[PDB]
Amino acid sequence: MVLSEGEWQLVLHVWAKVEADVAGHGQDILIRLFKSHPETLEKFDRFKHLKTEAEMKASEDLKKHGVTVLTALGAILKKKGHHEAELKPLAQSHATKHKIPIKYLEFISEAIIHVLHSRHPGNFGADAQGAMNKALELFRKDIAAKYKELGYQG
Ligand code: ZNH
């Protein structure tokens, strides 16, 4: 699959708003993820003890993680599909150390879309949401191919 330049621009124009407060968007996204799919929290030996949204919002380590995740994703999006270099180390750590199935990447993709839709109705209409879905699908497809090369079922 390949996105058009117009699709990339819709993706990057909403990402520009995310970048006003990457930390806040990261918290909202991780919390949505853990609330919708509580099993995903079990992957974080650092965070699996957090019991409530309140505890999640007050966690500095969780905030730090959201910034790390969104900054990595932002870098990948900015490559506009030319993301092999960024994807290599990410695919290896997530296949081999963290053991994150593609299904869980689908879950966080859903959380991203939900938070953007809630926070950014001005820049996340149907067309922009479609473009973001296409970008995240491409990310997941490319990660999935790497998983396979690396020996992980995903
Ligand atoms: C979209 C998307 C995404 C992105 C971009 C990311 C990114 C990332 C980064 C950058 C980091 C740091 C470095 C490495 O590699 O290690 C990480 C880590 C990581 N991660 Zn991940 N992620 C993700 C998804 C995910 C999910 C979904 C999960 C689960 C479920 C995860 C789990 C993880 C973990 C567990 C870790 C580690 C943490 C700590 O701190 O230790 N993850 N991550």
Side-chain angles (χ1 to χ4, degrees), residues 1-152 154:
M1 48 180 294
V2 174
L3 277 80
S4 74
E5 175 64 15
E7 282 163 346
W8 286 119
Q9 289 303 316
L10 292 176
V11 164
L12 299 170
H13 299 160
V14 74
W15 207 257
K17 307 304 176 205
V18 173
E19 289 180 337
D21 182 12
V22 189
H25 286 80
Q27 289 175 298
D28 284 358
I29 286 161
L30 293 173
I31 289 167
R32 171 28 84 127
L33 173 66
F34 298 150
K35 294 200 319 215
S36 298
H37 309 280
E39 66 269 30
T40 60
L41 188 53
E42 292 179 6
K43 291 288 176 179
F44 297 88
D45 302 348
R46 228 173 85 182
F47 313 128
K48 64 186 181 197
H49 65 290
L50 305 174
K51 300 182 181 283
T52 67
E53 169 160 13
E55 283 183 358
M56 287 171 205
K57 290 180 169 147
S59 167
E60 214 64 35
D61 281 352
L62 184 153
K63 183 208 270 86
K64 288 182 192 334
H65 181 67
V67 169
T68 293
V69 168
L70 293 191
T71 299
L73 184 61
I76 288 157
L77 293 173
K78 290 167 191 196
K79 295 310 288 299
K80 297 155 69 175
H82 299 276
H83 53 222
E84 175 71 23
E86 291 73 22
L87 248 61
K88 268 161 40 160
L90 187 72
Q92 183 179 43
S93 69
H94 284 61
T96 312
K97 186 155 300 163
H98 310 314
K99 272 128 177 139
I100 307 311
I102 299 295
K103 179 73 162 163
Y104 287 11
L105 295 184
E106 290 163 6
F107 295 165
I108 201 172
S109 296
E110 176 186 57
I112 289 160
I113 283 158
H114 173 95
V115 167
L116 297 176
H117 170 87
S118 181
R119 294 179 67 131
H120 297 296
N123 290 281
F124 207 69
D127 288 344
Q129 179 172 329
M132 181 63 75
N133 177 56
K134 206 166 160 180
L136 295 171
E137 261 202 71
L138 176 71
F139 167 68
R140 301 195 306 271
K141 172 176 169 149
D142 285 352
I143 284 285
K146 292 261 102 187
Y147 270 11
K148 199 205 210 298
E149 298 171 7
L150 292 161
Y152 179 53

PDB file of all heavy atoms in Angstrom, residues 2-35:
ATOM      1  N   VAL A   2       0.319   2.341  -0.579  1.00  0.00           N
ATOM      2  CA  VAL A   2       1.018   3.635  -0.646  1.00  0.00           C
ATOM      3  C   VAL A   2       0.049   4.803  -0.417  1.00  0.00           C
ATOM      4  O   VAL A   2      -1.005   4.859  -1.022  1.00  0.00           O
ATOM      5  CB  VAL A   2       1.778   3.814  -1.994  1.00  0.00           C
ATOM      6  CG1 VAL A   2       2.369   5.213  -2.116  1.00  0.00           C
ATOM      7  CG2 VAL A   2       2.903   2.780  -2.139  1.00  0.00           C
ATOM      8  N   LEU A   3       0.404   5.723   0.473  1.00  0.00           N
ATOM      9  CA  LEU A   3      -0.388   6.925   0.691  1.00  0.00           C
ATOM     10  C   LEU A   3      -0.043   7.995  -0.328  1.00  0.00           C
ATOM     11  O   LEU A   3       1.119   8.120  -0.748  1.00  0.00           O
ATOM     12  CB  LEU A   3      -0.131   7.497   2.094  1.00  0.00           C
ATOM     13  CG  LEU A   3      -0.923   6.871   3.255  1.00  0.00           C
ATOM     14  CD1 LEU A   3      -0.315   5.554   3.715  1.00  0.00           C
ATOM     15  CD2 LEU A   3      -0.981   7.869   4.394  1.00  0.00           C
ATOM     16  N   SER A   4      -1.040   8.791  -0.690  1.00  0.00           N
ATOM     17  CA  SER A   4      -0.817   9.974  -1.509  1.00  0.00           C
ATOM     18  C   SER A   4      -0.181  11.099  -0.685  1.00  0.00           C
ATOM     19  O   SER A   4      -0.224  11.075   0.541  1.00  0.00           O
ATOM     20  CB  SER A   4      -2.126  10.444  -2.138  1.00  0.00           C
ATOM     21  OG  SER A   4      -2.950  11.062  -1.169  1.00  0.00           O
ATOM     22  N   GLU A   5       0.429  12.071  -1.355  1.00  0.00           N
ATOM     23  CA  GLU A   5       0.934  13.270  -0.673  1.00  0.00           C
ATOM     24  C   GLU A   5      -0.190  13.972   0.107  1.00  0.00           C
ATOM     25  O   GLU A   5       0.031  14.442   1.221  1.00  0.00           O
ATOM     26  CB  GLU A   5       1.556  14.255  -1.685  1.00  0.00           C
ATOM     27  CG  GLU A   5       2.019  15.595  -1.093  1.00  0.00           C
ATOM     28  CD  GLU A   5       3.166  15.492  -0.072  1.00  0.00           C
ATOM     29  OE1 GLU A   5       3.834  14.443   0.024  1.00  0.00           O
ATOM     30  OE2 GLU A   5       3.411  16.488   0.641  1.00  0.00           O
ATOM     31  N   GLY A   6      -1.380  14.058  -0.492  1.00  0.00           N
ATOM     32  CA  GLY A   6      -2.524  14.688   0.167  1.00  0.00           C
ATOM     33  C   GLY A   6      -2.883  13.976   1.480  1.00  0.00           C
ATOM     34  O   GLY A   6      -3.211  14.631   2.474  1.00  0.00           O
ATOM     35  N   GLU A   7      -2.796  12.645   1.472  1.00  0.00           N
ATOM     36  CA  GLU A   7      -3.060  11.817   2.669  1.00  0.00           C
ATOM     37  C   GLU A   7      -1.984  12.083   3.701  1.00  0.00           C
ATOM     38  O   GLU A   7      -2.288  12.315   4.875  1.00  0.00           O
ATOM     39  CB  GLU A   7      -3.155  10.320   2.326  1.00  0.00           C
ATOM     40  CG  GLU A   7      -4.523   9.960   1.706  1.00  0.00           C
ATOM     41  CD  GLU A   7      -4.578   8.641   0.972  1.00  0.00           C
ATOM     42  OE1 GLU A   7      -3.528   8.037   0.668  1.00  0.00           O
ATOM     43  OE2 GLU A   7      -5.720   8.188   0.718  1.00  0.00           O
ATOM     44  N   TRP A   8      -0.723  12.089   3.260  1.00  0.00           N
ATOM     45  CA  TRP A   8       0.365  12.451   4.174  1.00  0.00           C
ATOM     46  C   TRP A   8       0.157  13.835   4.793  1.00  0.00           C
ATOM     47  O   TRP A   8       0.412  14.028   5.987  1.00  0.00           O
ATOM     48  CB  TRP A   8       1.759  12.347   3.507  1.00  0.00           C
ATOM     49  CG  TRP A   8       2.199  10.929   3.335  1.00  0.00           C
ATOM     50  CD1 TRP A   8       2.484  10.293   2.159  1.00  0.00           C
ATOM     51  CD2 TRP A   8       2.420   9.973   4.377  1.00  0.00           C
ATOM     52  NE1 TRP A   8       2.859   8.989   2.402  1.00  0.00           N
ATOM     53  CE2 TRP A   8       2.811   8.763   3.757  1.00  0.00           C
ATOM     54  CE3 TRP A   8       2.308  10.014   5.783  1.00  0.00           C
ATOM     55  CZ2 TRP A   8       3.104   7.598   4.491  1.00  0.00           C
ATOM     56  CZ3 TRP A   8       2.588   8.861   6.503  1.00  0.00           C
ATOM     57  CH2 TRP A   8       2.982   7.668   5.860  1.00  0.00           C
ATOM     58  N   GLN A   9      -0.295  14.805   3.999  1.00  0.00           N
ATOM     59  CA  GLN A   9      -0.484  16.138   4.554  1.00  0.00           C
ATOM     60  C   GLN A   9      -1.579  16.185   5.639  1.00  0.00           C
ATOM     61  O   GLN A   9      -1.422  16.893   6.632  1.00  0.00           O
ATOM     62  CB  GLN A   9      -0.714  17.195   3.454  1.00  0.00           C
ATOM     63  CG  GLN A   9       0.571  17.491   2.637  1.00  0.00           C
ATOM     64  CD  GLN A   9       1.728  17.950   3.525  1.00  0.00           C
ATOM     65  OE1 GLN A   9       1.539  18.771   4.425  1.00  0.00           O
ATOM     66  NE2 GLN A   9       2.923  17.401   3.299  1.00  0.00           N
ATOM     67  N   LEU A  10      -2.649  15.421   5.457  1.00  0.00           N
ATOM     68  CA  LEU A  10      -3.717  15.328   6.474  1.00  0.00           C
ATOM     69  C   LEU A  10      -3.163  14.720   7.762  1.00  0.00           C
ATOM     70  O   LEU A  10      -3.518  15.148   8.864  1.00  0.00           O
ATOM     71  CB  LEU A  10      -4.899  14.490   5.981  1.00  0.00           C
ATOM     72  CG  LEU A  10      -5.757  15.060   4.843  1.00  0.00           C
ATOM     73  CD1 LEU A  10      -6.813  14.032   4.435  1.00  0.00           C
ATOM     74  CD2 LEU A  10      -6.400  16.384   5.192  1.00  0.00           C
ATOM     75  N   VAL A  11      -2.304  13.716   7.609  1.00  0.00           N
ATOM     76  CA  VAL A  11      -1.672  13.037   8.740  1.00  0.00           C
ATOM     77  C   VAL A  11      -0.760  14.020   9.503  1.00  0.00           C
ATOM     78  O   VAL A  11      -0.855  14.178  10.735  1.00  0.00           O
ATOM     79  CB  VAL A  11      -0.875  11.778   8.260  1.00  0.00           C
ATOM     80  CG1 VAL A  11       0.109  11.268   9.334  1.00  0.00           C
ATOM     81  CG2 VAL A  11      -1.842  10.652   7.764  1.00  0.00           C
ATOM     82  N   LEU A  12       0.110  14.698   8.765  1.00  0.00           N
ATOM     83  CA  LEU A  12       1.081  15.589   9.378  1.00  0.00           C
ATOM     84  C   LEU A  12       0.450  16.878   9.932  1.00  0.00           C
ATOM     85  O   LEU A  12       0.946  17.426  10.921  1.00  0.00           O
ATOM     86  CB  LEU A  12       2.258  15.859   8.416  1.00  0.00           C
ATOM     87  CG  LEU A  12       3.053  14.614   8.002  1.00  0.00           C
ATOM     88  CD1 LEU A  12       4.038  14.926   6.867  1.00  0.00           C
ATOM     89  CD2 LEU A  12       3.742  13.935   9.192  1.00  0.00           C
ATOM     90  N   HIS A  13      -0.676  17.318   9.352  1.00  0.00           N
ATOM     91  CA  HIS A  13      -1.338  18.517   9.863  1.00  0.00           C
ATOM     92  C   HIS A  13      -2.006  18.242  11.212  1.00  0.00           C
ATOM     93  O   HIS A  13      -1.964  19.069  12.101  1.00  0.00           O
ATOM     94  CB  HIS A  13      -2.294  19.135   8.847  1.00  0.00           C
ATOM     95  CG  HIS A  13      -1.605  19.579   7.587  1.00  0.00           C
ATOM     96  ND1 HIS A  13      -2.274  19.787   6.400  1.00  0.00           N
ATOM     97  CD2 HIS A  13      -0.296  19.816   7.326  1.00  0.00           C
ATOM     98  CE1 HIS A  13      -1.411  20.154   5.464  1.00  0.00           C
ATOM     99  NE2 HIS A  13      -0.201  20.176   6.001  1.00  0.00           N
ATOM    100  N   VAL A  14      -2.577  17.057  11.393  1.00  0.00           N
ATOM    101  CA  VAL A  14      -3.062  16.735  12.748  1.00  0.00           C
ATOM    102  C   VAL A  14      -1.902  16.427  13.711  1.00  0.00           C
ATOM    103  O   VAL A  14      -1.951  16.794  14.888  1.00  0.00           O
ATOM    104  CB  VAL A  14      -4.157  15.627  12.794  1.00  0.00           C
ATOM    105  CG1 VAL A  14      -3.580  14.248  12.535  1.00  0.00           C
ATOM    106  CG2 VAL A  14      -4.871  15.662  14.176  1.00  0.00           C
ATOM    107  N   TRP A  15      -0.845  15.797  13.212  1.00  0.00           N
ATOM    108  CA  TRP A  15       0.315  15.514  14.078  1.00  0.00           C
ATOM    109  C   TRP A  15       0.926  16.813  14.623  1.00  0.00           C
ATOM    110  O   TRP A  15       1.420  16.861  15.753  1.00  0.00           O
ATOM    111  CB  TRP A  15       1.375  14.630  13.372  1.00  0.00           C
ATOM    112  CG  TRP A  15       2.138  13.860  14.387  1.00  0.00           C
ATOM    113  CD1 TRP A  15       3.385  14.111  14.844  1.00  0.00           C
ATOM    114  CD2 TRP A  15       1.633  12.756  15.169  1.00  0.00           C
ATOM    115  NE1 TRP A  15       3.712  13.212  15.841  1.00  0.00           N
ATOM    116  CE2 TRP A  15       2.656  12.365  16.049  1.00  0.00           C
ATOM    117  CE3 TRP A  15       0.427  12.046  15.177  1.00  0.00           C
ATOM    118  CZ2 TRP A  15       2.506  11.297  16.946  1.00  0.00           C
ATOM    119  CZ3 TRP A  15       0.273  10.973  16.085  1.00  0.00           C
ATOM    120  CH2 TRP A  15       1.314  10.617  16.943  1.00  0.00           C
ATOM    121  N   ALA A  16       0.868  17.870  13.822  1.00  0.00           N
ATOM    122  CA  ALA A  16       1.361  19.195  14.236  1.00  0.00           C
ATOM    123  C   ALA A  16       0.630  19.686  15.487  1.00  0.00           C
ATOM    124  O   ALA A  16       1.196  20.383  16.332  1.00  0.00           O
ATOM    125  CB  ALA A  16       1.199  20.189  13.102  1.00  0.00           C
ATOM    126  N   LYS A  17      -0.644  19.330  15.603  1.00  0.00           N
ATOM    127  CA  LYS A  17      -1.410  19.728  16.802  1.00  0.00           C
ATOM    128  C   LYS A  17      -1.035  18.846  17.976  1.00  0.00           C
ATOM    129  O   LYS A  17      -0.920  19.316  19.099  1.00  0.00           O
ATOM    130  CB  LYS A  17      -2.913  19.650  16.555  1.00  0.00           C
ATOM    131  CG  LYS A  17      -3.416  20.406  15.330  1.00  0.00           C
ATOM    132  CD  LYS A  17      -3.025  21.878  15.375  1.00  0.00           C
ATOM    133  CE  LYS A  17      -3.459  22.589  14.092  1.00  0.00           C
ATOM    134  NZ  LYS A  17      -2.672  23.804  13.740  1.00  0.00           N
ATOM    135  N   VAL A  18      -0.893  17.539  17.738  1.00  0.00           N
ATOM    136  CA  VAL A  18      -0.364  16.658  18.764  1.00  0.00           C
ATOM    137  C   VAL A  18       0.942  17.180  19.375  1.00  0.00           C
ATOM    138  O   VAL A  18       1.172  17.114  20.594  1.00  0.00           O
ATOM    139  CB  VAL A  18      -0.134  15.249  18.173  1.00  0.00           C
ATOM    140  CG1 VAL A  18       0.576  14.344  19.177  1.00  0.00           C
ATOM    141  CG2 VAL A  18      -1.452  14.684  17.740  1.00  0.00           C
ATOM    142  N   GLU A  19       1.805  17.704  18.524  1.00  0.00           N
ATOM    143  CA  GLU A  19       3.119  18.216  18.978  1.00  0.00           C
ATOM    144  C   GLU A  19       3.105  19.463  19.866  1.00  0.00           C
ATOM    145  O   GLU A  19       4.119  19.831  20.443  1.00  0.00           O
ATOM    146  CB  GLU A  19       4.053  18.382  17.787  1.00  0.00           C
ATOM    147  CG  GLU A  19       4.487  17.039  17.260  1.00  0.00           C
ATOM    148  CD  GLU A  19       5.424  17.144  16.079  1.00  0.00           C
ATOM    149  OE1 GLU A  19       5.421  18.182  15.399  1.00  0.00           O
ATOM    150  OE2 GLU A  19       6.173  16.169  15.865  1.00  0.00           O
ATOM    151  N   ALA A  20       1.958  20.128  19.971  1.00  0.00           N
ATOM    152  CA  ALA A  20       1.793  21.216  20.927  1.00  0.00           C
ATOM    153  C   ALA A  20       1.934  20.707  22.358  1.00  0.00           C
ATOM    154  O   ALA A  20       2.374  21.441  23.264  1.00  0.00           O
ATOM    155  CB  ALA A  20       0.434  21.866  20.744  1.00  0.00           C
ATOM    156  N   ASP A  21       1.576  19.438  22.567  1.00  0.00           N
ATOM    157  CA  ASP A  21       1.613  18.848  23.903  1.00  0.00           C
ATOM    158  C   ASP A  21       1.750  17.339  23.790  1.00  0.00           C
ATOM    159  O   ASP A  21       0.795  16.603  24.067  1.00  0.00           O
ATOM    160  CB  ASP A  21       0.335  19.179  24.709  1.00  0.00           C
ATOM    161  CG  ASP A  21       0.358  18.600  26.160  1.00  0.00           C
ATOM    162  OD1 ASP A  21       1.411  18.136  26.647  1.00  0.00           O
ATOM    163  OD2 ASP A  21      -0.697  18.625  26.819  1.00  0.00           O
ATOM    164  N   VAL A  22       2.940  16.871  23.416  1.00  0.00           N
ATOM    165  CA  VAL A  22       3.091  15.431  23.159  1.00  0.00           C
ATOM    166  C   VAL A  22       2.837  14.649  24.449  1.00  0.00           C
ATOM    167  O   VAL A  22       2.176  13.625  24.434  1.00  0.00           O
ATOM    168  CB  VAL A  22       4.462  15.064  22.572  1.00  0.00           C
ATOM    169  CG1 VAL A  22       4.423  13.622  22.139  1.00  0.00           C
ATOM    170  CG2 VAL A  22       4.706  15.892  21.343  1.00  0.00           C
ATOM    171  N   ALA A  23       3.307  15.187  25.574  1.00  0.00           N
ATOM    172  CA  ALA A  23       3.152  14.512  26.854  1.00  0.00           C
ATOM    173  C   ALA A  23       1.668  14.243  27.207  1.00  0.00           C
ATOM    174  O   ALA A  23       1.316  13.115  27.565  1.00  0.00           O
ATOM    175  CB  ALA A  23       3.846  15.301  27.959  1.00  0.00           C
ATOM    176  N   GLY A  24       0.823  15.276  27.105  1.00  0.00           N
ATOM    177  CA  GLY A  24      -0.618  15.153  27.359  1.00  0.00           C
ATOM    178  C   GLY A  24      -1.315  14.165  26.441  1.00  0.00           C
ATOM    179  O   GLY A  24      -2.147  13.369  26.901  1.00  0.00           O
ATOM    180  N   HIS A  25      -0.956  14.183  25.150  1.00  0.00           N
ATOM    181  CA  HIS A  25      -1.568  13.266  24.193  1.00  0.00           C
ATOM    182  C   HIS A  25      -1.108  11.845  24.506  1.00  0.00           C
ATOM    183  O   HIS A  25      -1.888  10.922  24.400  1.00  0.00           O
ATOM    184  CB  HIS A  25      -1.192  13.615  22.746  1.00  0.00           C
ATOM    185  CG  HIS A  25      -1.879  14.837  22.214  1.00  0.00           C
ATOM    186  ND1 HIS A  25      -1.454  16.119  22.508  1.00  0.00           N
ATOM    187  CD2 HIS A  25      -2.947  14.972  21.385  1.00  0.00           C
ATOM    188  CE1 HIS A  25      -2.254  16.991  21.910  1.00  0.00           C
ATOM    189  NE2 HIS A  25      -3.149  16.323  21.201  1.00  0.00           N
ATOM    190  N   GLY A  26       0.157  11.684  24.887  1.00  0.00           N
ATOM    191  CA  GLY A  26       0.672  10.359  25.254  1.00  0.00           C
ATOM    192  C   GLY A  26      -0.092   9.782  26.431  1.00  0.00           C
ATOM    193  O   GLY A  26      -0.422   8.590  26.441  1.00  0.00           O
ATOM    194  N   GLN A  27      -0.331  10.589  27.462  1.00  0.00           N
ATOM    195  CA  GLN A  27      -1.069  10.097  28.635  1.00  0.00           C
ATOM    196  C   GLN A  27      -2.463   9.635  28.233  1.00  0.00           C
ATOM    197  O   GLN A  27      -2.880   8.530  28.583  1.00  0.00           O
ATOM    198  CB  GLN A  27      -1.197  11.200  29.683  1.00  0.00           C
ATOM    199  CG  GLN A  27       0.139  11.526  30.367  1.00  0.00           C
ATOM    200  CD  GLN A  27      -0.010  12.684  31.293  1.00  0.00           C
ATOM    201  OE1 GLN A  27      -0.346  13.781  30.849  1.00  0.00           O
ATOM    202  NE2 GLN A  27       0.180  12.451  32.602  1.00  0.00           N
ATOM    203  N   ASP A  28      -3.171  10.467  27.476  1.00  0.00           N
ATOM    204  CA  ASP A  28      -4.547  10.143  27.052  1.00  0.00           C
ATOM    205  C   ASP A  28      -4.581   8.850  26.245  1.00  0.00           C
ATOM    206  O   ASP A  28      -5.433   8.008  26.455  1.00  0.00           O
ATOM    207  CB  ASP A  28      -5.150  11.265  26.185  1.00  0.00           C
ATOM    208  CG  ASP A  28      -5.573  12.475  26.971  1.00  0.00           C
ATOM    209  OD1 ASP A  28      -5.449  12.491  28.206  1.00  0.00           O
ATOM    210  OD2 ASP A  28      -6.028  13.438  26.325  1.00  0.00           O
ATOM    211  N   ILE A  29      -3.632   8.706  25.314  1.00  0.00           N
ATOM    212  CA  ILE A  29      -3.555   7.522  24.464  1.00  0.00           C
ATOM    213  C   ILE A  29      -3.261   6.235  25.248  1.00  0.00           C
ATOM    214  O   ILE A  29      -3.959   5.229  25.089  1.00  0.00           O
ATOM    215  CB  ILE A  29      -2.542   7.762  23.317  1.00  0.00           C
ATOM    216  CG1 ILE A  29      -3.201   8.707  22.301  1.00  0.00           C
ATOM    217  CG2 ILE A  29      -2.205   6.451  22.592  1.00  0.00           C
ATOM    218  CD1 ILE A  29      -2.233   9.405  21.364  1.00  0.00           C
ATOM    219  N   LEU A  30      -2.235   6.257  26.098  1.00  0.00           N
ATOM    220  CA  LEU A  30      -1.926   5.066  26.916  1.00  0.00           C
ATOM    221  C   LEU A  30      -3.083   4.693  27.852  1.00  0.00           C
ATOM    222  O   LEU A  30      -3.413   3.518  28.007  1.00  0.00           O
ATOM    223  CB  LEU A  30      -0.628   5.258  27.703  1.00  0.00           C
ATOM    224  CG  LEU A  30       0.655   5.342  26.858  1.00  0.00           C
ATOM    225  CD1 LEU A  30       1.842   5.701  27.741  1.00  0.00           C
ATOM    226  CD2 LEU A  30       0.965   4.014  26.069  1.00  0.00           C
ATOM    227  N   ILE A  31      -3.690   5.691  28.473  1.00  0.00           N
ATOM    228  CA  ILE A  31      -4.793   5.442  29.398  1.00  0.00           C
ATOM    229  C   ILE A  31      -5.972   4.818  28.641  1.00  0.00           C
ATOM    230  O   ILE A  31      -6.542   3.839  29.103  1.00  0.00           O
ATOM    231  CB  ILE A  31      -5.180   6.718  30.186  1.00  0.00           C
ATOM    232  CG1 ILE A  31      -4.077   7.049  31.214  1.00  0.00           C
ATOM    233  CG2 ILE A  31      -6.551   6.525  30.876  1.00  0.00           C
ATOM    234  CD1 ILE A  31      -4.200   8.458  31.834  1.00  0.00           C
ATOM    235  N   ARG A  32      -6.294   5.344  27.456  1.00  0.00           N
ATOM    236  CA  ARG A  32      -7.382   4.810  26.622  1.00  0.00           C
ATOM    237  C   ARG A  32      -7.063   3.350  26.306  1.00  0.00           C
ATOM    238  O   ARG A  32      -7.905   2.461  26.505  1.00  0.00           O
ATOM    239  CB  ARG A  32      -7.542   5.664  25.356  1.00  0.00           C
ATOM    240  CG  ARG A  32      -8.500   5.169  24.205  1.00  0.00           C
ATOM    241  CD  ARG A  32      -9.636   4.300  24.631  1.00  0.00           C
ATOM    242  NE  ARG A  32     -10.796   5.024  25.091  1.00  0.00           N
ATOM    243  CZ  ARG A  32     -12.042   4.863  24.642  1.00  0.00           C
ATOM    244  NH1 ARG A  32     -12.341   4.006  23.665  1.00  0.00           N
ATOM    245  NH2 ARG A  32     -13.006   5.590  25.183  1.00  0.00           N
ATOM    246  N   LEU A  33      -5.835   3.104  25.852  1.00  0.00           N
ATOM    247  CA  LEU A  33      -5.371   1.736  25.567  1.00  0.00           C
ATOM    248  C   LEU A  33      -5.573   0.771  26.743  1.00  0.00           C
ATOM    249  O   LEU A  33      -6.162  -0.308  26.577  1.00  0.00           O
ATOM    250  CB  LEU A  33      -3.879   1.752  25.190  1.00  0.00           C
ATOM    251  CG  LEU A  33      -3.213   0.374  25.018  1.00  0.00           C
ATOM    252  CD1 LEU A  33      -3.792  -0.375  23.829  1.00  0.00           C
ATOM    253  CD2 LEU A  33      -1.681   0.551  24.897  1.00  0.00           C
ATOM    254  N   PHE A  34      -5.068   1.153  27.915  1.00  0.00           N
ATOM    255  CA  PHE A  34      -5.123   0.301  29.103  1.00  0.00           C
ATOM    256  C   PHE A  34      -6.548   0.108  29.599  1.00  0.00           C
ATOM    257  O   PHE A  34      -6.882  -0.953  30.148  1.00  0.00           O
ATOM    258  CB  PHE A  34      -4.256   0.878  30.217  1.00  0.00           C
ATOM    259  CG  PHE A  34      -2.784   0.974  29.880  1.00  0.00           C
ATOM    260  CD1 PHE A  34      -1.998   1.974  30.452  1.00  0.00           C
ATOM    261  CD2 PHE A  34      -2.169   0.044  29.022  1.00  0.00           C
ATOM    262  CE1 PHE A  34      -0.621   2.075  30.166  1.00  0.00           C
ATOM    263  CE2 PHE A  34      -0.799   0.132  28.735  1.00  0.00           C
ATOM    264  CZ  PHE A  34      -0.023   1.140  29.301  1.00  0.00           C
ATOM    265  N   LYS A  35      -7.394   1.116  29.400  1.00  0.00           N
ATOM    266  CA  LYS A  35      -8.811   1.002  29.760  1.00  0.00           C
ATOM    267  C   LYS A  35      -9.603   0.101  28.812  1.00  0.00           C
ATOM    268  O   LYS A  35     -10.411  -0.711  29.268  1.00  0.00           O
ATOM    269  CB  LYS A  35      -9.474   2.386  29.907  1.00  0.00           C
ATOM    270  CG  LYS A  35      -8.908   3.198  31.092  1.00  0.00           C
ATOM    271  CD  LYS A  35      -9.834   4.345  31.588  1.00  0.00           C
ATOM    272  CE  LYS A  35     -10.521   5.143  30.459  1.00  0.00           C
ATOM    273  NZ  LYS A  35     -10.681   6.617  30.766  1.00  0.00           N
TER     274      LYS A  35
END
